[PDB]
Amino acid sequence: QSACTLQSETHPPLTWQKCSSGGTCTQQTGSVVIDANWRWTHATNSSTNCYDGNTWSSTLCPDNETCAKNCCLDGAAYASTYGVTTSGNSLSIDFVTQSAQKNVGARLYLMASDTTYQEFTLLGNEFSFDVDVSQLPCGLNGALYFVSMDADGGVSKYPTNTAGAKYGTGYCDSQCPRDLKFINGQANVEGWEPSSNNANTGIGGHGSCCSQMDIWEANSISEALTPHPCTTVGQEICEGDGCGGTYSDNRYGGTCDPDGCDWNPYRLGNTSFYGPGSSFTLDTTKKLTVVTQFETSGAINRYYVQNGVTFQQPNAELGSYSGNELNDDYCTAEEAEFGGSSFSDKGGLTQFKKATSGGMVLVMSLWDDYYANMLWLDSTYPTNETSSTPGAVRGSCSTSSGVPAQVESQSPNAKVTFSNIKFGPIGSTGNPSG
Ligand SMILES: O=[N+]([O-])c1ccc(O[C@@H]2O[C@H](CO)[C@@H](O[C@@H]3O[C@H](CO)[C@H](O)[C@H](O)[C@H]3O)[C@H](O)[C@H]2O)cc1
Ligand SMILES: O=[N+]([O-])c1ccc(O[C@@H]2O[C@H](CO)[C@@H](O[C@@H]3O[C@H](CO)[C@H](O)[C@H](O)[C@H]3O)[C@H](O)[C@H]2O)cc1
Ligand SMILES: *[C@@H]1O[C@H](CO)[C@@H](O)[C@H](O)[C@H]1NC(C)=O
Ligand SMILES: [Co+2]
Ligand SMILES: [Co+2]
Ligand SMILES: [Co+2]
Ligand SMILES: [Co+2]
């Protein structure tokens, strides 16, 4: 796609800290940009929609190439259309925003410049952020994560993409998502099927795969930490059901692991660690700090801070595994006790280290789940299982919770605030901000 300017594009500023092994931190100035899927896509030479509701213009978009040649992405009114605001080091995303139309959630990228994404090399480093999940009920996900996206949004590889990172192009993740409207500088109108339960979305003939570090998928009830490896580290198109992921009838596709090696302390048996109010170790009615460390072995370490008290990731015992480090022993024990082979089949933490060795883009989002009602995060899943099934129970939410139409109607003013991002060598991010 190209870019049009019927609506101005002003990225909300966002600062973050870069810390050094020598004990100091330096303020960095960036901004956030909304993903291309949330934007108005219209004809380059008029106001005619290329995409409207959950259907493409059959005249502007008769095939993927012609569509991209005829169509552009336009600017975003971040606050008034999308409920996205920033203040210094703080980003807030509102769940439902009513303007001329109804918007649900947002997916945003941290920028280095007004035309490029920030790339972070996680290996050997740690990432800290503060989060307020108090206004996230059952069925919502305030997500902070990394993906192996191109810094330019794909412009250098795909000449027919001239909108780039400035307009939120080039998304990929471990679901190899087929809901994207543009992949590799072409539309996704070929094979498009509208969603039966979402007036604004559908599933195309292509998807966009890449490695994914899910640092944080959470609400006020449950939280999870999940690396996902792919056989190709970086952004790669996939065809139809070969994509696997949420958007394919067969979840287990050819290149990415859509399950990951997940760590949810509730799922692992500690139902008292994280939840709303003073009966939990971490009280989700109050802001908390989350620190994630990528040791050069390829293992992942985690600790939390609230009201000046530090907690390592809680210990878990699972088969022969015992500890709080996410390592090959944990991931292998998890497959043996909870089932599945996706993570190991796609090369496990060894393959995942190929992604953290390189650059990855920071994503912050808020979404509800039109496929599985977020039950995998915060409830019993599958819903016919009980606590006698190892791993079935992931949080205290009813298996009835998280119907999109219901949570959109009942909790439209749900929101997530991410703040005080700090990045640097392992051990550096608890030092004074600059
Ligand atoms: O030692 N520490 O590092 C430490 C100790 C206590 C503590 O308490 C939390 O402090 C924050 C910030 O002052 C509180 O949040 C604010 O509370 C206000 C209540 O009127 C209002 O809602 C503000 O918007 C909100 O940010 C929080 O309730 C405390 O538990 C933090 C750190
Ligand atoms: O018996 N088993 O082996 C079995 C049966 C069902 C099942 O459900 C999967 O659980 C995983 C771990 O929670 C779920 O994965 C996640 O999917 C999210 C949305 O796509 C997001 O990708 C997370 O980061 C990821 O872990 C998966 O959706 C369930 O189908 C697991 C095992
Ligand atoms: C849950 O983890 C916290 C933090 O490590 C610990 O203090 C508490 O004892 C744990 N409770 C259970 C039931 O494991
Ligand atoms: Co608001
Ligand atoms: Co995931
Ligand atoms: Co094709
Ligand atoms: Co270690």
**CATH number where 113 lies:** 2.70.100.10
Q: Tell me, using a 6 A CB cutoff, whether residue 273 lines ligand 3.
A: yes
CA-to-CA dists, residue 411 to 104, 229, 338, 371, 378, angstroms: 11, 34, 33, 19, 17
CA-nearest residue for atom 13, ligand 2, is 376
- Helix 348-356 to helix 328-338 angle (10° resolution) is 130
State in Å: Cα 260 to ligand 2 middle.
8
- The experimental technique behind this entry is X-ray
Ligand in nearest proximity to the CA of 299:
7
3-state secondary structure the chain: CEECCCCCCCCCEEEEEEECCCCCEEEEEEEEEECHHHCCEEECCCCCECEECCEECCCCCCCHHHHHHHEEECCCCHHHHHCEEEECCEEEEECEEECCCEEECEEEEEEEECCEECEECCCCEEEEEEEECCCCCCCEEEEEEEECCCCCCCCCCCCCCCCCHHHCCCCCECCCCCCCCEECCEECCCCCEECCCCCCCEECCEEEECCEEEEEEECCCCEEEEEECECCCCCEEEEHHHHCCCCCCCCCCCCECCCCCCECCCCCCCCCCEECCCCCCEECCCCEEEEEEECCCCCEEEEEEECCEEEECCCEEECCEEECCECHHHHHHHHHHHCCCHHHHCCHHHHHHHHHCCCEEEEEEEEECCCCCCHHHHCECCCCCCCCCCCCECCCCCCCCCCHHHHHHHCCCCEEEEEEEEEEECCCCCCCCC
Query: What residues have a C-beta under 5 A from ligand 7, the ion?
Result: 295, 299
Domain count, the chain: 1
Q: Which of 147, 217, 259, 352 to mutate to test the pocket of ligand 2 (most atoms within 8 A of CB)?
A: 259
Measured CA to CA, the distance from residue 124 to residue 356 in angstroms comes to 9
In which domain, by residue range, is 36 found? 2-434
Q: Which of 432, 430, 434, 397 is nearest to 128 (CA)?
A: 430
- Whether omega for the bond prior to residue 382 falls within 30 degrees of 0, making it cis, is yes
State in Å: Cα 397 to ligand 3 middle.
20
CA-nearest residue for atom 11, ligand 3, is 270
Q: Tell me, using a 6 A CB cutoff, whether residue 371 lines ligand 3.
A: no
Q: Tell me, using a 6 A CB cutoff, whether residue 246 lines ligand 2.
A: yes
Ligand in nearest proximity to the CA of 190:
6
Measured CA to CA, the distance from residue 267 to residue 337 in angstroms comes to 12
State in Å: Cα 134 to ligand 4 middle.
14
State in Å: Cα 16 to ligand 6 middle.
39
User: Residue 35 — φ and ψ, nearest 5°?
Assistant: -55, 145
State in Å: Cα 259 to ligand 2 middle.
5
State in Å: Cα 135 to ligand 4 middle.
11
Q: Tell me, using a 6 A CB cutoff, whether residue 262 lines ligand 2.
A: yes
User: Residue 332 — φ and ψ, nearest 5°?
Assistant: -65, -45
